[PDB]
Structure 1
Amino acid sequence: ELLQVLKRGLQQVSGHGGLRGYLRVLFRANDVRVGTLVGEDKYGNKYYEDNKQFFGRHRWVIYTTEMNGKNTFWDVDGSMVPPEWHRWLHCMTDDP
């Protein structure tokens, strides 16, 4: 049972990049978790959600590095997400 949970963590690190991929997600975002990606957004925002995970699981709306000219890499807030928040992030079901 403990070996299966450890294998799931190792596969999660292998999914999102690797040694440089998971470390970039751990420093920028609060927690790193793998899931299905929506992709399509103005100014390259990831928005990889769709996973069952837990309560209110429209997870991981990763902010784009420099959206207009702010260089949001170390510091980023909820200033991003262009007209897609009502569906992919909050209320509706279908992807925008």
Structure 2
Amino acid sequence: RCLPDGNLLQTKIHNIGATLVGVDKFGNKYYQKLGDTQYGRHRWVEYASKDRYNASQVPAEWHGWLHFITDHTGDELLSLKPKRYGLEHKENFSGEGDAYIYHSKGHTLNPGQKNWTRYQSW
């Protein structure tokens, strides 16, 4: 706890009756409080980064279960993530310095700014 400075207190006021369904690699604890009441508020995630958290830290294995699109906890879709090309999540580093943010291939901030001139000069 010790955060009376966030809405994280609203999540920690949840979890009082909720059951913990799995926890992904990053530490985000995925909770479920069904049966009681208030559909739409019976699946959430405790981000395990009580500060500096934001959305999109929820990996794709769980981002289904947590938006109610599926009923497969990330401990069940982890047997379906492709091993050959599977890639870990990236938290959406939007703005947090260059080389973390994404860059196109001509942005002059991207190492290896490609030239698009279709004609090959002499």
TM bin (shorter chain): 0.5 to 0.7
Structure 1: give runs of 5+ residues left out of the alignment.
1-20, 66-72
Give the structure with the larger helix fraction: 1
Query: Does the alignment pair 1:79 with 2:62?
Result: no
| Corresponding letter in the other structure for 2:59 | P
Task: Tell me the CA shift for residue 30 of structure 1.
Answer: 5.0
> Paired residue for 1:18?
none
Query: Does the alignment pair 1:54 with 2:31?
Result: no
User: Alignment partner of 1:56: what SS?
Assistant: coil
| 4+ aligned runs moved over 6 Å, structure 1 | none
Taking structure 2 as the reference length, the TM-score comes to 0.44
Report percent identity of matched pairs.
31
Structure with greater Cα Rg: 2
- Work out the CA distance in 1 between the residues paired with 2:21 and 2:53: 20
> Paired residue for 2:47?
63
Give the structure with the larger strand fraction: 2
Q: 1:37 to 1:74 in 2, by over 3 A?
A: same
Structure 2: give runs of 5+ residues left out of the alignment.
75-122
Q: 1:79 to 1:57 in 2, by over 3 A?
A: same
RMSD: 2.3
| Corresponding letter in the other structure for 1:44 | G
Q: 1:30 to 1:60 in 2, by over 3 A?
A: farther
Taking structure 1 as the reference length, the TM-score comes to 0.53
Greater relative CO, 1 or 2 (CA 8 Å, sep 6+): 1
Query: Does the alignment pair 1:91 with 2:69?
Result: yes
> Paired residue for 2:87?
none
Equivalent residues, number: 67
Task: Answer whether contact 1:88 1:94 (CA < 8 A) is retained.
Answer: no
